[PDB]
């Protein structure tokens, strides 16, 4: 009796050990992705384009008459442009006049890779569209494909229902 319960414990721990190792591999990828996104942010000619979209994207989700755009101070010149080019479009897609201001007193932490968060007039409704939030929001949904892409498909799964 003692031998087989000890081997069961050992096999169960071995299963947990390899599972933890697999999760470490997934984390290393995501941490590399974060660094890769930072390298993209450093490129003004592509980061400004992201900001152009990211600001407008948040604006469409709130659909409020008053907007406050919050960013890290370092990127303010580009958020300013992203807002300026976003309003003409907003007034066309929604047919609603929106007063969009940038918060010059409150800033995002300096260690945020990039992106913006947008608040409504009373700061009760906010959308978080920074690069870390997008990376996790997408990665958590694409994970089923990452699992297969890195470790192979499960040979025992035949149906997708």
């Amino acid at each position: 009796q003692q031998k087989k319960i000890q081997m069961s414990n050992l096999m169960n721990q071995a299963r947990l050990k390899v599972l933890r190792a697999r999760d470490d591999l997934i984390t290393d990828l995501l941490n590399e992705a974060k660094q890769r996104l930072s390298k993209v942010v450093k490129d003004t000619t592509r980061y400004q384009v992201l900001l152009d979209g990211l600001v407008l994207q948040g604006l469409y989700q709130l659909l409020e008459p008053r907007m406050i755009v919050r960013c890290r101070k370092q990127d303010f010149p580009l958020v300013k442009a992203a807002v300026q080019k976003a309003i003409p479009m907003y007034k066309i897609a929604t047919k609603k006049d929106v007063d969009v201001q940038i918060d010059l007193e409150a800033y995002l932490p300096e260690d945020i890779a990039g992106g913006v968060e947008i608040y409504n007039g009373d700061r009760k409704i906010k959308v978080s569209n920074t690069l870390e939030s997008r990376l996790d929001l997408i990665a958590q949904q694409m994970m089923p494909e990452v699992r297969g892409a890195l470790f192979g498909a499960n040979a025992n799964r035949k149906f997708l229902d």
């Binding site: 087989k4 319960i5 069961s8 414990n9 096999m11 169960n12 299963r15 947990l16 599972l19 933890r20 697999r22 999760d23 997934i26 994207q57 948040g58 989700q61 709130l62 659909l63 700061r123 009760k124 409704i125 906010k126 959308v127 978080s128 569209n129 939030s133 997008r134 929001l137 997408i138 949904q141 694409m142 994970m143 089923p144 699992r147 297969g148 499960n154 025992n156 799964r157 035949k158 149906f159 997708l160 229902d161």
Partner: protein, 459 residues
């Protein structure tokens, strides 16, 4: 997938019992999940049970104690509780919220399935035609289990329904004379019960094929009504996408019903009996009917939703509505347990709806159906004789009555009594049946035709 950023609100309108009501919500979605953070950093989740205009009513799983009105921060995931599922969940232990508690990592999903599930198209559902050998004569003979059947054990507080379920997990095979993946939802139980099963599964050497979901008596009562769906959702993945035969055991379903009743009272829903929601049946069907084989796929799900009967009342809504949904029940009682009979299974009030297809030529032995029906007649009559003799006395009985008392006494100690590790085949069970039936002369075995008695009775 969902590429749009999710919105976060600090617009809580008010709190009433377990329900947190938000206003100013953009296009609320019905039955979507909300993640909320309390002023002290505590994270909790809930589901939108109602939307109206800009308002939404969120039922919080962990509870509403400490929920603020001004500082509470909520975000809407934008979908229903779809949960991560993978093949390698077998061998893992989860809590009632779907998170691991075995110090392993979170689930690395192969897909995300809707916890509510979908009804299986009755035209593609294939009627079960295979028998599972439980090794318990009280079941394999007179109330057989088919693969894909739903058979709860109706029990009562203090009875060894946990030992019977544990026994079934180890010695459940086939009568084709096989490794079942077990998904065990331990909800509304104490530590010792959950540790009992966890230890038994390791003792059986089968833990690598067992997935546990734990929600203990000291855990939130709202999570107790998704735990079964988490277990079944995994079972559906394993059975219908990976063609693995799965055995799903849901512990005292009465803790599910009581958790549901609390929610029903909180939402002021129309009661039926004993305060339970008038839709209790529909909700139970959502849980129970996630079972059976599907045509064209080699998997199956078999359920054993054991439940405790409050005050041994077989008409209590919990066993009553279950009895209407499941294919019968095993039913244990105190009259057998109080005499140290194990397993304490009382066949008289029991049945198996799929049993008639499961027995007989091509399945077990051709006399199976005849032996079962006659044993029921003789057992029930013996019980009737005891009811008579209790008043009139032994002297008022004739030889026709004493034979049924002899059968009844020998039946319970030879047929029902076995022991936790006595594993009998279905053929041995029938042989025992005949040994007891041969107590009576042919003329009294009125449920069996002479075309069967002439072959089997002489032995």
């Amino acid at each position: 997938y969902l590429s749009q950023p999710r919105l976060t609100y600090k617009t809580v309108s008010g709190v009433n019992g377990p329900l947190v009501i938000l206003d100013h919500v953009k296009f609320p979605r019905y039955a979507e999940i909300v993640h909320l953070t309390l002023p002290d950093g505590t994270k909790r989740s809930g589901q939108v049970l109602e939307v109206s205009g800009s308002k939404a009513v969120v039922q919080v799983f962990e509870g509403t104690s400490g929920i603020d009105a001004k500082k509470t921060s909520c975000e809407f995931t934008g979908d229903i509780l779809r949960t991560p599922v993978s093949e390698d969940m077998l061998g893992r232990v989860f809590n009632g919220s779907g998170k691991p508690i075995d110090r392993g990592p979170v689930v690395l999903a192969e897909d995300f399935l809707d916890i509510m599930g979908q009804p299986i198209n009755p035209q593609c559902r294939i009627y079960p035609e295979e028998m599972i050998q439980t090794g318990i004569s009280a079941i394999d003979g007179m109330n057989s289990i088919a693969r894909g059947q739903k058979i709860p054990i109706f029990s009562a507080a203090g009875l060894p329904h946990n030992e019977i379920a544990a026994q079934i997990c180890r010695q459940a095979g086939l009568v084709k004379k096989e490794n079942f993946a077990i998904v065990f939802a331990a909800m509304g139980v104490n530590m010792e019960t959950a540790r009992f099963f966890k230890s038994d599964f390791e003792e059986n050497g089968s833990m690598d094929n067992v997935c546990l979901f734990l929600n203990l008596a000291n855990d939130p009562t709202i999570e107790r009504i998704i735990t079964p769906r988490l277990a079944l959702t995994t079972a559906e993945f394993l059975a219908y996408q990976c063609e693995k035969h799965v055995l799903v055991i849901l512990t005292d379903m009465s803790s599910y019903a009581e958790a549901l009743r609390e929610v029903s009272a909180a939402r002021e829903e129309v009661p039926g009996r004993r305060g339970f929601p008038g839709y209790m049946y529909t909700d139970l069907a959502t849980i129970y009917e996630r079972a059976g084989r599907v045509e064209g796929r080699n998997g199956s799900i078999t359920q054993i939703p054991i439940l405790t009967m409050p005050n041994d009342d077989i008409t209590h809504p919990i066993p009553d509505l279950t009895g209407y949904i499941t294919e019968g029940q095993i039913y244990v009682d105190r009259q057998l347990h109080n005499r140290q009979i194990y397993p304490p299974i009382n066949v008289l009030p029991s049945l198996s709806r799929l049993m008639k297809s499961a027995i007989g030529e091509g399945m077990t032995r051709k006399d199976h159906a005849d032996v079962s029906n006659q044993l029921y007649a003789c057992y029930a009559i013996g019980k009737d004789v005891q009811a008579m003799k209790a008043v009139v006395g032994e002297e008022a009985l004739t030889s026709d009555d004493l034979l049924y008392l002899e059968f009844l006494q020998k039946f319970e100690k030879n047929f029902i009594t076995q022991g936790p590790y006595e594993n009998r085949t279905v053929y041995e069970t029938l042989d025992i049946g005949w040994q007891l039936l041969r107590i009576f002369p042919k003329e009294m075995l009125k449920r069996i035709p002479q075309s069967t008695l002439s072959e089997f009775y002489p032995r």
